[PDB]
Amino acid sequence: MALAAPPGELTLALTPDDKTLDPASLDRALAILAEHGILVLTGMLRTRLTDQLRTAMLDDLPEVLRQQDVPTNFVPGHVQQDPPVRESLLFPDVLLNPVVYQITHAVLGADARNAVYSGNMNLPGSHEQPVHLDEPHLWPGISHPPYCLCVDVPLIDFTLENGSTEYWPGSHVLNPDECYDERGCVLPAELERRRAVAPPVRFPIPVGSVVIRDGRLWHRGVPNLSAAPRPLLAMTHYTEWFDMPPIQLPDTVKSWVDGSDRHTHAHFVAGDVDHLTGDHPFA
Amino acid sequence: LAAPPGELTLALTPDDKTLDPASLDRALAILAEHGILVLTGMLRTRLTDQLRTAMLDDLPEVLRQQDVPTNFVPGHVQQDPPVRESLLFPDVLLNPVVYQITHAVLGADARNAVYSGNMNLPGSHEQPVHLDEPHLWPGISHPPYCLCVDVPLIDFTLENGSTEYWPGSHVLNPDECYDERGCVLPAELERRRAVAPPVRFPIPVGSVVIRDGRLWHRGVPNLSAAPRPLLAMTHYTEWFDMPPIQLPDTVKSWVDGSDRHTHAHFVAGDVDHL
Ligand SMILES: O=C(O)CNC(=O)C(=O)O
Numbered sequence: 274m275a276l277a278a279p280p281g282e283l284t285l286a287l288t289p290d291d292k293t294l295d296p297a298s299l300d301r302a303l304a305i306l307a308e309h310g311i312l313v314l315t316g317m318l319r320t321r322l323t324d325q326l327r328t329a330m331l332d333d334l335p336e337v338l339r340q341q342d343v344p345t346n347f348v349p350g351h352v353q354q355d356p357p358v359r360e361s362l363l364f365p366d367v368l369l370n371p372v373v374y375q376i377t378h379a380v381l382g383a384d385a386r387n388a389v390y391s392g393n394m395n396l397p398g399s400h401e402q403p404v405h406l407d408e409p410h411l412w413p414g415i416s417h418p419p420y421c422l423c424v425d426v427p428l429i430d431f432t433l434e435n436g437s438t439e440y441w442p443g444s445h446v447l448n449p450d451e452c453y454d455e456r457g458c459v460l461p462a463e464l465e466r467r468r469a470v471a472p473p474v475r476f477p478i479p480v481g482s483v484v485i486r487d488g489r490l491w492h493r494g495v496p497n498l499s500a501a502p503r504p505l506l507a508m509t510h511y512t513e514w515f516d517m518p519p520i521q522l523p524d525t526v527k528s529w530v531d532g533s534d535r536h537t538h539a540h541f542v543a544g545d546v547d548h549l550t551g552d553h554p555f556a
Numbered sequence: 557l558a559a560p561p562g563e564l565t566l567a568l569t570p571d572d573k574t575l576d577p578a579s580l581d582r583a584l585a586i587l588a589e590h591g592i593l594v595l596t597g598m599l600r601t602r603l604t605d606q607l608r609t610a611m612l613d614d615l616p617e618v619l620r621q622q623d624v625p626t627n628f629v630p631g632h633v634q635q636d637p638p639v640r641e642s643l644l645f646p647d648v649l650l651n652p653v654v655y656q657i658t659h660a661v662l663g664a665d666a667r668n669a670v671y672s673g674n675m676n677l678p679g680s681h682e683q684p685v686h687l688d689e690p691h692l693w694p695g696i697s698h699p700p701y702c703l704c705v706d707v708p709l710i711d712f713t714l715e716n717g718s719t720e721y722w723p724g725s726h727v728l729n730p731d732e733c734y735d736e737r738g739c740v741l742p743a744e745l746e747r748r749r750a751v752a753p754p755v756r757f758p759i760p761v762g763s764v765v766i767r768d769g770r771l772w773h774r775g776v777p778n779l780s781a782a783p784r785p786l787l788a789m790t791h792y793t794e795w796f797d798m799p800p801i802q803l804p805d806t807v808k809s810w811v812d813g814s815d816r817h818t819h820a821h822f823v824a825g826d827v828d829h830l
Pocket residue numbers: 346351393395402407436437438439492493494495505
C-alpha cells in the first residue's frame with residue numbers, strides 16, 4: 274500500500290532542536306516500535322549534515338563501481354556502500370543522536386551500542402529485493418524481545434519513484450518454524466499468510482528523517498525508477514551481549530566517541546580508515 | 557544425598573564417544589526440566605590426575621599474590637588451569653559427548669569461551685545463591701544460550717564443598733529477582749525453596765556436570781584439610797559476546813580444525829594463566 278507521506282500511526286514529527294522527547298512522546302515512540310516494529314522521526318537532522326553525507330557518498334560511488342566484484346544486496350542496483358569515517362564527516366548528531374539513544378536506551382538498555390556504520394546506494398534501474406530481515410531471531414520457533422534497532426538515515430527525499438523501502442508492520446515478532454532461509458529471506462508461504470492479515474506499506478520519507486526499526490522487521494529494497502542514485506546511511510544498535518565486529522574509526526574522534534554514555538563498539542586506528550575495502554594495515 | 561540422584565544422572569565410560577538417540581533425548585530432557593545433568597565415568601584417571609596435580613602445584617603461587625581473586629566470600633579462589641600443550645587434552649576441551657549435548661541445545665555454532673577453575677580452600681565461607689550467567693532480558697522466559705561444563709578434579713563430598721544446585725531454577729526470571737552480581741533476592745530464594753528445595757550430593761572424579769548457565773547454585777564451606785579443585789568451561793551460542801580464551805599456537809592445529817568450536821586467541825610461546 275503506497276501513501277503520500279509517512280503514516281501518522283508510525284510517525285513522530287520533530288525539529289533538529291529537539292534533544293530529548295518528553296515522557297508522553299517517548300511513550301508513544303516506544304508503543305509504535307513495540308506494536309509496528311518501525312518508527313519514522315521526521316525533521317531530526319539539519320540539511321547541513323545530510324548535504325555533506327549525500328555529497329561524500331555520491332563522490333565515492335565511482336570508486337565502489339570500479340571494484341572487480343561490486344558488493345550487492347540480493348539483486349542488481351542495491352549496492353553496499355559504507356560512508357566515510359573521516360573526522361570531517363563524523364557528526365555527533367548522526368553517530369550519537371540524543372533522541373535515537375533515548376529510544377534505544379529505553380528498548381535495549383543503557384549499555385546498548387551502535388556496531389554498524391554502513392549504507393545502501395539504490396541505483397537507477399535497480400531490481401526488486403526479496404522480503405527479508407536484516408537480523409535474525411536468536412532461536413527458531415521462539416518469541417523474544419528486541420536485541421537490535423536499525424537506524425536508517427535517508428540522504429535525499431525518498432519517494433515511491435526512487436526506491437523508498439517497503440516495510441511489513443508488526444512482522445518483527447513473527448518467528449514460526451521454517452519461516453526464514455539461510456539469507457534471512459521470508460519463505461513465500463509465510464509471506465502470503467502475513468500479507469492477508471497485515472499487508473506491507475511504502476511511503477515517501479523526507480531527508481532529515483530517521484527511521485528506527487526492529488532489526489527483525491520484514492522489509493525489501495524496491496526499484497529506483499528516478500534518474501539519480503538514492504543513498505541511505507545505516508546504523509544498528511545492539512544489546513551489549515550481542516557479538517559484532519567493531520566499527521573501525523580514526524583515533525581523531527576517540528575523544529568524543531569513547532567519552533559518551535551513547536556507546537559505540539569501536540576500534541580506533543592511527544591513520545585514515547579505508548571505509549570502502551577495510552584494507553588499512555592494522556585492521 | 558549419598559550419590560548423584562538418578563533423575564539428574566547418566567552413567568558413561570571413557571569409551572562412550574556418542575550417546576545413542578534414547579540417551580541424548582534423556583540428557584536434553586534432564587537439562588530442559590532440571591537445568592543440571594551429571595555424567596559419571598567420562599574422563600580417564602590419567603587426565604584428572606595431571607590436571608589436579610597441576611592446579612594444586614600452582615596454588616602456593618596463586619595465594620602469594622597481593623590481590624587473590626575470590627568469588628563473593630573467603631576461600632572460593634578463581635584459579636585458571638595451565639594452558640601448556642602438555643595439559644591441554646582433546647577429551648577435556650573438545651569432549652565428543654559434551655559437544656553432542658551442547659550442539660543439540662545451543663546449535664552447531666556453539667563455542668567454548670571459558671577455560672577456568674574454582675579452588676575451594678579449607679575453612680571457606682558460604683557463597684550467596686547466584687547464577688553465573690544472567691537472563692538476557694528481565695521478566696522474560698527464553699531458552700538457554702550457555703551451558704557450564706564443570707570437571708571436578710577430586711571426589712566431591714558433602715564435607716569438601718560439593719556445589720549446592722537449585723534444580724529447575726534455570727527458567728525463573730521474575731522482575732526484581734537478581735542484583736548486579738547475579739545473586740538471587742532472598743524473598744525469591746525462600747518462595748522457590750518451598751516448591752523445589754536445593755540439593756547437594758557427592759560427585760566422583762571422572763564426572764562432568766553440564767548445567768544451564770542461569771542455574772541457581774552456591775559454593776559451600778570445604779570442611780576437609782585439602783583444597784577442592786574444579787575445572788570450569790562454558791559453551792555459548794555463537795552470538796553471545798565473550799573475550800577469547802588465550803591458548804598457545806602449539807594446539808592451534810587440533811583446536812582451530814575442529815567442528816567442536818572454541819572462541820580462542822592463539823599466542824606464540826606460553827600463556828601466563830595467573
Ligand atoms: O535500501 C533499501 O531500501 C533496503 N535495503 C535492504 O533492505 C538491504 O539491502 O538489506
